């Protein structure tokens, strides 16, 4: 006999299992099972599907393997099947995230500016955030080599359970990164995995319970804290407020001193209110008068934009951003 032959046949078996993701093997994988139990995924979502979601596309081994001298070696993963990876799933998950999150944000804040809305959406479902979520869930990367695994003589089940992409061995050894594309990044792979899981959930539940996916998203993605007030940065807000007042049936906004203390000091306090008629729109405190005025305008704009109506109200469609 020969040990090379033994290793080779093991590798071949592993490749075959990757191509298939046979259901029994996937079931045997403890990590997959624990992930399934942790997230409370549907029973219709098979363990093979979950394994596939963790399998990123990796058809051909790249040219950068040829030289570890240039700071890269791809020796962990094994080639995947063209029609059994997380790629199609991932796209679907991304689409779902882009639809649902955005919709939820619009429901919450129907006048939110377009740029601000986009930023909020990004915050909710940015690649880094998605990667973090995946890490939290316990989607671990297949860092160990194939040869090493063979030597240990571990089953293929464990491999199936881990996340599988062209992860560069010696990525940041001796403090040297190679700056490769998105197809070799860990964060991206983790993002794909979390999107792929969502897509798989959708696939299994859509006919029985159409909104199951969206309630899962709400539980995991939309449950996260984001203060929308911290997102804004105005420029000349008084002018913008005046424009807004003009657009609506409101009197011209003027700022007026409500209260004042410590004028002729290092740190005064000036309270000014931007009135439109007798109604106050924005209240603004400040060290200077100018500052206070600015703050009142910004407050007014916040109140305009971040207005969140009740669920009992009929839908509020805003009349666009205030084009100054």
């Amino acid at each position: 006999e020969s040990e090379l032959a033994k290793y080779k046949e093991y590798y071949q078996g592993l490749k075959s299992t990757v191509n298939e993701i046979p259901e029994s093997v996937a079931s045997k994988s403890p990590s997959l099972r624990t992930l399934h139990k942790r997230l409370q995924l549907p029973n219709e979502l098979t363990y093979s599907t979950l394994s596939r979601c963790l399998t990123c596309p990796s058809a051909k081994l790249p040219d950068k393997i040829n030289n570890p001298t240039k700071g890269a070696a791809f020796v962990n993963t094994v080639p995947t099947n063209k029609y059994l990876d997380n790629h199609g799933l991932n796209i679907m998950g991304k689409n779902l995230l882009s639809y649902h999150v955005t919709k939820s944000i619009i429901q919450k804040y129907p006048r939110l500016p377009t740029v601000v809305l986009n930023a909020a959406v990004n915050a909710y479902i940015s690649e880094a955030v998605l990667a973090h979520i995946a890490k939290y869930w316990g989607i671990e990367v297949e860092t160990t080599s194939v040869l090493s695994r063979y030597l240990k003589m571990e089953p293929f089940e464990f491999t199936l359970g881990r996340l599988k992409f062209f992860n560069n061995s010696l990525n940041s050894k001796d403090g040297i990164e190679l700056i490769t594309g998105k197809n070799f990044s860990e964060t991206s792979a983790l993002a794909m995995s979390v999107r792929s899981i969502i897509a798989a959930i959708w696939a299994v539940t859509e006919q029985k319970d159409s909104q199951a996916v969206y309630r899962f998203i709400d539980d995991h993605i939309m449950s996260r804290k984001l203060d929308i007030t911290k997102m804004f940065q105005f420029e000349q807000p008084t002018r913008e407020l005046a424009m807004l007042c003009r657009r609506e049936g409101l009197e011209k906004p003027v700022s007026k001193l409500v209260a004042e203390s410590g004028r002729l000091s290092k740190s005064p306090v000036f309270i000014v209110h931007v009135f439109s008629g007798e109604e106050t729109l924005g209240e603004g405190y400040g060290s200077s008068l100018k500052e206070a005025k600015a703050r009142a305008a910004t407050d007014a704009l916040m109140k305009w934009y971040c207005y969140e109506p009740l669920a009992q109200q009929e839908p509020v469609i805003d009349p666009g951003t205030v084009v100054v």
Partner: protein
Amino acid sequence: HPFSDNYASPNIYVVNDVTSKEQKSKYDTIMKEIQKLEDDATRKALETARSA
């Protein structure tokens, strides 16, 4: 001498007791075998070049 089958609850498992020394020996044999294979192929290529 526990095993993964012994526990009968699929989230439990026992990692394989392969001695470090044995693994090292296996590695040595495989890389050596590869080297042997390569060297013979190179020799053959040299012989072919010499011929024509």
